[PDB]
Amino acid sequence: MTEIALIGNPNSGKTSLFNLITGHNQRVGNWPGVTVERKSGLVKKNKDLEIQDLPGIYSMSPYSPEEKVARDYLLSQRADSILNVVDATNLERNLYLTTQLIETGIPVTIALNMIDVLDGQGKKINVDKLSYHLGVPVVATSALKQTGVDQVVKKAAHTTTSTVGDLAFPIYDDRLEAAISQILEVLGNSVPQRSARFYAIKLFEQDSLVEAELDLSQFQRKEIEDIIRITEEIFTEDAESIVINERYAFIERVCQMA
């Protein structure tokens, strides 16, 4: 019925949560022809929902096979929803992947895990103000104390590709936004409308996998090269770095509440 994808940074509490949600309704196996573990399973309480676990990754780079597995699954549109496990204690760095996940076009829910530790240190997070400015639902969870779990799985199940109409994509500096829009318009119907922005930013970044597994015309390829060149001249920096700078700048802007 409903396909929810669990993903986040290594040691954010993925396995911990995954175990509490699925119980022993788990199946361990293979991603095709890749030396990467594949596990999935039914939600213990709502048996019509299935959770597909994804590799612990810091970002959708084209290098490690763990990230090719994650990129491919989330762009296959098999998942109805993305349940993002975020470490509360290292909130800033965790959101880096989050911004990339949102761009896939599959609705993202944040399980702000390890909320118990946050209290011990003294640091606080405004869950309401964070959620709104980030544009995604945020449910504080603790895999230790076992709080927020059922509340986040419920949120995830109701935040799907068939429920969500308006998807707030992280808006960056106008100069980069001009480029994304220029790449998008040129792409036309060559990319899935949902994943359009993911592919657009990946083409700007000059991503190996995206370019290779996309049959773009001579006209399209030339136009995308021009846009990249001029944007590099405007920012006086390479395309990969403009995007990295823009993600963190957005992350600090969102942390105007935290």
Ligand X SMILES: Nc1nc2c(ncn2[C@@H]2O[C@H](COP(=O)(O)OP(=O)(O)O)[C@@H](O)[C@H]2O)c(=O)[nH]1
Contact characters 187-226, ligand X, x per CB under 6 A: ----------------------------------------
Sign of CA dihedral 248, 251, 255, 258: negative
Q: How far apart are CA 59 and CA 127, in angstroms?
A: 23
**CB neighbours of residue 237 within 10 Å:** 13
Summarize the annotated binding site for GTP as residue ranges. Answer: 8-15, 33-37, 53-56, 113-116
Here the tokens at position 191 are 């990319």
Interface with ligand X (CB under 6 A), residue from 2, 13, 149, 201? 13
**3 lies in the site for ligand X, by CB under 6 A:** no
Which amino acid makes up residue 155?
K
Torsion of CA 208, 210, 216, 218, to 10 degrees: -20
Contact characters 126-165, ligand X, x per CB under 6 A: ----------------xxx---------------------
Give me the helix-helix angle, 239-254 and 174-187, nearest 10°. 120
* Shortest separation between residue 4's beta carbon and ligand X, angstroms: 16
Compare residues 144 and 230 and give the one whose CB is closer to ligand X: 144
**20 lies in the site for ligand X, by CB under 6 A:** no
**37 lies in the site for ligand X, by CB under 6 A:** no
Fill in the DSSP letter of residue 49.
E
Interface with ligand X (CB under 6 A), residue from 116, 211, 232, 238? 116
Burial of 29 from C-beta contacts in 10 A (0-12 / 13-18 / 19+): exposed
Interface with ligand X (CB under 6 A), residue from 36, 56, 131, 244? 56
Residues 249, 173 contacting (CB under 8 angstroms): yes
Q: How far apart are CA 184 and CA 189, in angstroms?
A: 9
Compare residues 120 and 165 and give the one whose CB is closer to ligand X: 120
**11 lies in the site for ligand X, by CB under 6 A:** yes
**52 lies in the site for ligand X, by CB under 6 A:** no
Q: Which residues of the shown chain bind ligand X in the complex (CB under 6 A)? A: 10-16, 56, 113-114, 116-117, 142-144
